Design a protein around this ligand. Structure first.
Ligand SMILES: Nc1ncnc2c1ncn2[C@@H]1O[C@H](COP(=O)(O)OP(=O)(O)O)[C@@H](O)[C@H]1O
Ligand SMILES: Nc1ncnc2c1ncn2[C@@H]1O[C@H](COP(=O)(O)OP(=O)(O)O)[C@@H](O)[C@H]1O
Ligand SMILES: [Mg+2]
Lengths: 161, 100, 333, 192, 192, 56, 90
């Protein structure tokens, strides 16, 4: 509901920029986190897509890149940057990129901490260079008005709390 | 919040795409109308909770309990209804085939 | 579409044994394809898939059983291995490679690809302490929109929510896990039951009683187990089972050689006594049904290498000593 | 020195001691003189096995020349207290205390090897001091003798008088004889 | 101390002690005096090997000067009870108890080194007390001696009378002499 | 950003973006300003051994 | 030959070259043998994909040029190689 108001107010017909707020769905495994995302796409009037955090990796590695998430969004928006800059995204398995008891950072956690570092500018908002289809053009998509939902199981977080 | 026996029972019928409704449509293609008793669903939740499978376990439990039921219906006509009872889940009993 | 009985009849023609497993696949395939064809469902309900899980030792006919279903229908079929798949960001490959081989086999046809089936072997050996591969594969199951390049440039993407996933593997030690759960936990001791007779039904019987808790102990992630609601068990080919494989199956090993021999007006009588020896050799080397071909091939190569050398050949008689290698099948004239 | 063993499991590799490995299979070893320290170790194992699975039998191998009576009774009560059936197997020998525990196993689960010695005798004790104290300890040891005889008769099925007469002095019984006397149910000579 | 060795396998590199390393290959060492504690250790190893593979023979290296008869009998019963054949090899020496276990191996799988020495003698014991109780123990030792001779004759193959005559006093047999007497099947001199 | 010769983005891409803001005017782009956020992430893993090139 | 989808080399040139030596006759073409050397060099342990690429024409394929799409059900695909490392695998 708030996202639609921001989209309808995309012309900034006020004295503020109507910043966005991202959600973090922390639920026990098997509670329906993924279901809540699929069901939400049946009544959404804006492009929506799903992604997995286990496949994501830091830039410059064989693993998947964070910018690939926006690539899927363009397909749902008919490769329209205007429509893609106001869509929704639901990241999954966000609890797997958490540091694996390696706070000292002996080695760079490309599959862990490295993914979080690359996503910092994505959630807040940054002009990302997405491939033309899937490097000659590197289409520029602004993620400042794109909502990012993160869903994970966080197995063991109960002990910390 | 974690799903409980009561939640599983509701999820078995309340959702528009519930597991029970999905099987009902599957049997509707053949012509027979499938019905799930309240007690049957209650036992289903207890089995899933014991196995720790949760909601996903519901599909496995029903598949095994209805495997033989749907193994003859395609080639075994004259049936009109197939009532499911709690005992059917345990395997002691068998589907109460009805003819009409 | 053909009823489960028709599918089972076809399976029995090319498969001997595993009656319980054949029933599961016959019903599973019938429902899976029935849901695909009846996408409307006559209502607003969205029928969900029921992935299949096969559990059986090596050489149990899992690949052959799956091949029969694909061959019976006019849809593509693909195979894969779990040991090759790895996590993202590593030297190993990713689960996406599985879809890469599906499009090529399906001729890059989305419609024909969805109706297709895919099989996985060696599902085990990647359990906890490894876990990453399961998480990567957990996405493919339950539905995805993975994309693959075309003409291998719109990057045609195939949905994985209408494709049947058949996971098979040889679980070593699962019998012991089930034994404790379904029997006395005696293990080592004077009052225990040591498997010294090489019982071929104990494993099959125990595996048939497998439950999700048993898989959890094995190391399988509970989420992965949930994605596979349907489960099937296959028994190990015993001595008597192997004997039937040589003659009972439609495209049996003997029939293939008999057809080649009778093509030149030469009968090929496979002595019932020689058949048991052939099967016994397979069990000795634990080569399974695959070894059967090699065992017969060697015994027939010498016989078929000299048969055309002379004319008037009327018939051949394979015997026990021929399999052992100390004699040659007498030729009729 | 106890050799180490490796248990191969689908989950992963694991190392165990020779005795620890058999403990996972619900097997307990009773060796050497019976005392409070060794008795507690056996009692702890029985309690641990009961918690893991209270519906599976527990196998106890008895090979000892006996020992303290209080320590032995601590094990006898534990066997009856826990619902799981405690199977007793005699290896080598089973003295008074060992024989008492051997016959204390669940009916039908008491076994003995073909070449094994079983000895049963009345309790042994001693006390020095004032005459009044002698009577107190003398009466207590007598009560223990009577209590043990009653338990032996119940498990073996023999009469009270017969147990007293046979237990008055050391009585060596072979594996076949132990079967007739009721101390054991069967003899395990080979694995079928 | 006990040296540690590394074993290469599919899983990776694993550290094993010298004795534990050889236990994987179904090799059990019977060194020193035979007692209840060491006897149970060998029994546990034999049972563990049976479960791992009940179709592969077990090798038992015997190098001991004897020990308690009851403790040794526990090993003998275990060897005969377990389906796998137990191969006994005599290294250094094999006294009465050691010789009895040496000849208790599966017929045809008993070996002895060229310079090994085997000695067999009747059971040794003793008792101090009254005349009634000493008669009980004095009568039990004879039963053990008779039972021991019967088993020795069965495995060796010689007549019971001959065993009694040779077992009356200590008798030392060399590796070749043990073959004729039936205590061993062959002699291992070199690897072929 | 990533070292040259790898799949990751190159350092020169920063100037490309600056040119777009300046209408691809080299003279204009040669006098602009540039901000590099998350500079602490590219910090070398001192603890990590100097065996694998830290392209990231 | 390259892997399926690669443009460096043509993977269907083997079925095409065969007809050239067979005077473009279906009967003559579908009567010989096609020896594919060095198959172990591409065998797994990208290389694995090549095997599947060749399987496209090994069975159930109609690809020829006078496009003639001639079948290869009779062509004997005798694959040869040294299989360096097969001895230790066995
Ligand atoms: N609260 C719920 N209501 C209805 N169905 C549920 C619920 N939770 C789980 N499910 C079932 O679980 C399946 C999907 O599980 P999923 O959402 O992937 O688990 P997770 O949330 O751990 O990712 C669906 O088939 C759905 O029917
Ligand atoms: N019942 C059977 N009849 C004929 N062949 C069989 C049978 N079972 C297995 N096979 C042979 O085994 C091969 C496939 O084995 P596979 O299913 O891969 O075993 P596993 O799945 O246990 O590794 C086929 O080539 C087939 O010839
Ligand atoms: Mg999920």
């Amino acid at each position: 509901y708030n996202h639609y108001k921001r989209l309808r107010n995309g012309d900034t017909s006020n004295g503020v920029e109507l910043g966005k707020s991202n959600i973090l769905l922390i639920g026990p495994t098997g509670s329906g986190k993924t279901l809540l995302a699929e069901t939400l796409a049946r009544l959404l009037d804006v492009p929506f897509t799903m992604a997995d955090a286990t496949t994501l990796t830091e830039a410059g590695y064989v693993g998947e890149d964070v910018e690939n998430i926006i690539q899927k969004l363009l397909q749902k928006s008919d490769y329209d940057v205007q429509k893609a800059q106001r869509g929704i995204v639901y990241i999954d398995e966000i609890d797997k990129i958490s540091r694996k008891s390696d706070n000292p950072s002996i080695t760079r956690d490309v599959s862990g901490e490295g993914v979080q570092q690359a996503l910092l500018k994505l959630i807040e908002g940054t002009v990302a260079a997405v491939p033309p289809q899937g490097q000659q053009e590197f289409l520029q998509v602004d993620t400042s008005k794109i909502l990012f939902i993160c869903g994970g199981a966080f197995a063991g977080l109960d002990k910390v709390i | 919040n974690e799903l409980s026996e009561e939640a599983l029972i509701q999820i078995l019928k309340e959702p528009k795409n519930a597991l029970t409704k999905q099987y009902q449509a599957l049997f509707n293609l053949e012509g027979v109308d499938l019905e799930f008793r309240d007690e049957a669903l209650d036992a289903i939740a207890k089995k899933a909770m014991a196995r720790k499978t949760g909601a996903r376990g519901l599909r496995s439990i029903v598949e095994a309990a209805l495997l033989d039921t749907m193994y003859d219906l395609p080639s075994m006509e004259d049936v009109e209804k197939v009532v499911i009872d709690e005992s059917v889940i345990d395997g002691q009993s068998e589907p109460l085939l009805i003819y009409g | 579409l053909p009823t489960p009985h028709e599918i089972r009849n076809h399976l029995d023609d090319y498969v001997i044994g595993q009656e319980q497993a054949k029933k599961v696949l016959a019903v599973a395939v019938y429902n899976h394809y029935k849901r695909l064809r009846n996408g409307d469902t006559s209502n607003g309900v969205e029928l969900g898939k029921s992935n299949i899980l096969l559990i059986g030792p090596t050489g149990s006919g899992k690949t052959l059983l799956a091949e029969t279903l694909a061959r019976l229908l006019d849809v593509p079929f693909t195979m894969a291995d779990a040991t090759t798949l790895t996590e993202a960001g590593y030297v190993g490959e990713d689960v996406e490679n599985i879809i890469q081989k599906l499009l090529q086999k399906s001729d890059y046809d989305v419609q024909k690809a969805q109706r297709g089936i895919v099989y996985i072997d060696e599902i085990d050996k990647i359990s906890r302490k490894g876990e990453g591969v399961q998480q990567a594969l957990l996405k493919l199951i339950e539905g995805t929109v993975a994309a693959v390049p075309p003409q291998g440039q719109e990057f045609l993407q195939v949905d994985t929510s209408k494709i049947l996933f058949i996971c098979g593997g040889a679980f070593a030690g699962l019998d012991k896990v089930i034994s404790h759960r379904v029997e006395t936990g005696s293990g080592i001791g004077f009052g225990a039951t040591v498997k010294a007779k090489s019982d071929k039904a104990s494993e099959g019987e125990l595996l048939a009683q497998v439950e999700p808790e048993d898989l959890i102990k094995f190391g399988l992630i509970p989420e992965f187990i949930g994605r596979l609601p349907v489960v099937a068990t296959l028994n190990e080919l015993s001595e008597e089972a192997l004997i039937q494989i040589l003659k009972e199956p439609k495209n049996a090993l003997t029939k293939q050689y008999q057809a080649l021999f009778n093509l030149e007006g030469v009968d090929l009588e496979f002595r019932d006594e020689a058949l048991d020896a052939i099967a016994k050799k397979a069990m000795a080397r634990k080569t399974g049904a695959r070894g059967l071909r090699s065992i017969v091939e060697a015994a027939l190569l010498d016989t078929m290498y000299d048969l055309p050398s002379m004319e008037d050949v009327e018939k051949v008689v394979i015997d026990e000593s021929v399999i052992d290698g100390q004699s040659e099948p007498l030729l009729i004239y | 020195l106890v050799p180490m063993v490796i248990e191969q499991t689908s989950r992963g590799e694991r190392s165990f001691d020779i005795y620890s490995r058999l403990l996972k299979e619900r097997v307990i070893f009773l060796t050497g003189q019976v005392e409070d320290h060794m008795a507690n170790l056996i009692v702890a194992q029985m309690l641990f096995l009961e918690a893991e699975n209270p519906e599976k039998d527990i196998y106890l191998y008895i090979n000892s020349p006996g020992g303290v009576i209080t320590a032995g009774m601590s094990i006898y009560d534990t066997m009856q207290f826990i619902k799981p059936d405690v199977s007793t197997i005699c290896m080598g020998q089973a003295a008074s205390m060992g024989a008492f525990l051997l016959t204390a196993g669940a009916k039908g689960k008491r076994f003995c090897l073909p070449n094994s010695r079983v000895m049963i005798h009345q309790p042994l004790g001693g006390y020095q001091g004032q005459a009044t104290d002698i009577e107190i300890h003398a009466r207590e040891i007598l009560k223990v003798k009577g209590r043990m005889n009653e338990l032996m008769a119940l498990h073996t099925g023999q009469s009270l008088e017969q147990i007293e007469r046979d237990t008055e002095r050391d009585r060596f019984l072979s594996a076949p004889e132990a079967v007739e006397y009721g101390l054991v149910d069967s003899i395990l000579t080979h694995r079928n």
